[PDB]
């Protein structure tokens, strides 16, 4: 379960970082280069946007409590938001909410 | 192999979108970033670093044809640059090289 997630820990911190160093008039640019070339799709996050947990089968409420004590505690693990199908997981950057649907 | 050639590849090219993306002024504090809190150390390639292949053992050989399927087939993938160990694979942005080691 470790395995797995780390994996997503280290796409999630590199999305993150790459956000976080981006020179600002070539962000959005950087959005669309995620998605298509490494299949991440960053959205921000509302306080409104709902989600639906991963079913508690096999090991997923092992490799969620492996996530969060890499990320924080507060971080959210999603098989949909707002009635789209995923793996998502949220992260911040200071005050801005933000999703990654890989 | 393809299971471990899909990560290291996903590692990769989040790693060169976060450099390419970058704002001008911020490269050399993303670069510590990206070492410190991602375990990812990038280095500029230059044609005269000394590089050794990786043993062909176990099932390296087909990794490390599955990372240039990916990457292209000129991406050196080595286990160790200028006599320092490590998981090593270039990458290139335009007419620059570049090391990543992990």
Redesign the interface.
């Given at each position: 379960a470790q395995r797995v997630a780390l994996?997503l820990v280290?796409?999630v911190?590199?999305?993150r970082?790459?956000l976080?160093?981006?020179?600002?008039d070539?962000?959005r640019?950087?959005l669309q280069?995620?998605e298509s070339?490494?299949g991440?799709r960053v959205y921000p996050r509302e306080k409104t946007d709902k989600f639906k947990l991963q079913p508690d089968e096999s090991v997923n409420r092992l490799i969620e409590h492996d996530i969060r004590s890499r990320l924080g505690d507060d971080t959210v693990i999603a098989q949909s938001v707002n009635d789209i199908p995923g793996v998502w997981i949220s992260f911040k950057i200071d005050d801005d909410d933000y999703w990654v649907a890989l």
């Open positions: 994996q280290a796409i911190k590199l999305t970082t790459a976080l160093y981006s020179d600002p070539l962000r640019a950087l280069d995620l070339n490494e991440v």
